[PDB]
Design a protein around this ligand. Structure first.
Ligand code: 4DM
Ligand code: 4DM
Ligand code: MG
Ligand code: MG
Lengths: 197, 200
């Protein structure tokens, strides 16, 4: 009857109806309380969504900080893949994350990641841009995957390249395509960092 | 009614009520026709969104094919920039695009795009993965842009640590375009290194 139990109902509802159907009204029903009483703990849908994003990563993003000795390349790769896996746990998990900014509970992690970059030859700006590029790529890759599978519920002799392309994409959940683009980002950051020197 | 009529009012309604608010019931109302009349044009919201996605690129994605003698680098950069502009045109445009596949009317262009990549020494697979990476990154950047601004009215926390404070300062300084162009160019430089790694 608090803030934490809103969150655990709201995760269940999200999986059931998705982000669109996750309303203040519907969550109150599922909890069996009035709408203003959810407010004491989860103000509105934005605050609720913000809380859900944080909880999803807290539970299911099991890599955030570099290990002793770890390259920034490896740090970026593991962070991106872990974030992807976490977004994929819940339905519309990536939609939930869109437009959120770091929460008070994540500040020390995020700061350590930013510091790490600056310690590995990046300017704060460039270290940040690299991280945001990895985050944006992961968000779009997952949101495309998540939405395409959803859309097959409703949607019903090809050119040789496109036919081959489609077979390649349908081979898995997008993972190999993801890992390729992720490495390309990393390889590009490396070139840029070497360039500057 | 006919196709352009349905499409023009759908796009207008998208700007009015956004993707969540958009319903075939409200489009029929707006068009002044009964439900089954529209049904035979758009069977549901998923069909409507598909039709909108295609139309938005048809009208506002001004670049798709490379000029004679244009580099693959430039081709990728130009497709992304143009894709982003088309997505920025209408409310929730990046959300409308999500999940779709190329339409039969886009097949000829896509095949030409894939072949061009193979003509520059990409395997079909790696050319595909390059194009998808640029698309995905562009969607995510745009969606993050369209969504953070959206939630603006829903004071900077005094407990913000310094790199994070400054980082958030850096991000707000513009509409996301600087970060987007840096990310796009990182992708392109990485494709280059990879293509060179193999083609050596
Ligand atoms: C480093 C940084 C990240 C994120 C940001 O939003 C940032 C931002 O808005 C400004 C400056 C830096 C940011 C994330 O959203 C992120 O997904 C995140 O929060 C967590 C995490 N909580 O573990 C990550 O591990 C990766 C990402 C790091
Ligand atoms: C090659 C390919 C593209 C796209 C896809 O969605 C694909 C997909 O979902 C599966 C397999 C291949 C895809 C696009 O969305 C894209 O933005 C597009 O359609 C157009 C375009 N219409 O001009 C492009 O110019 C580039 C992109 C090509
Ligand atoms: Mg984020
Ligand atoms: Mg697409």
């Amino acid at each position: 009857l608090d803030k934490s139990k809103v969150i655990n109902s709201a995760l269940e509802l999200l999986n059931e109806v998705g982000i669109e159907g996750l309303t203040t009204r519907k969550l109150a029903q599922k909890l069996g309380v009035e709408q203003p009483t959810l407010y004491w703990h989860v103000k509105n849908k934005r605050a609720l969504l913000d809380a859900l994003a944080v909880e999803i990563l807290a539970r299911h993003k099991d890599y955030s900080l570099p290990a002793a000795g770890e390259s920034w390349q490896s740090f970026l790769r593991n962070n991106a893949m872990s974030f992807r896996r976490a977004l994929l746990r819940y339905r519309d998990g990536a939609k939930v994350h869109l437009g959120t900014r770091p929460d008070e509970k994540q500040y020390d992690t995020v700061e350590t990641q930013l510091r790490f970059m600056t310690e590995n030859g990046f300017s704060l700006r460039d270290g940040l841009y690299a991280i945001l590029a990895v985050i944006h790529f992961t968000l779009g890759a997952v949101l495309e995957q998540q939405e395409h599978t959803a859309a097959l519920t409703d949607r019903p002799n090809l050119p040789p390249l496109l036919r081959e392309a489609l077979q390649i994409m349908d081979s898995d959940d997008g993972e190999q395509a993801f890992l390729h683009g992720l490495e390309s980002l990393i390889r590009g950051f490396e070139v840029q960092l070497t360039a500057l020197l």
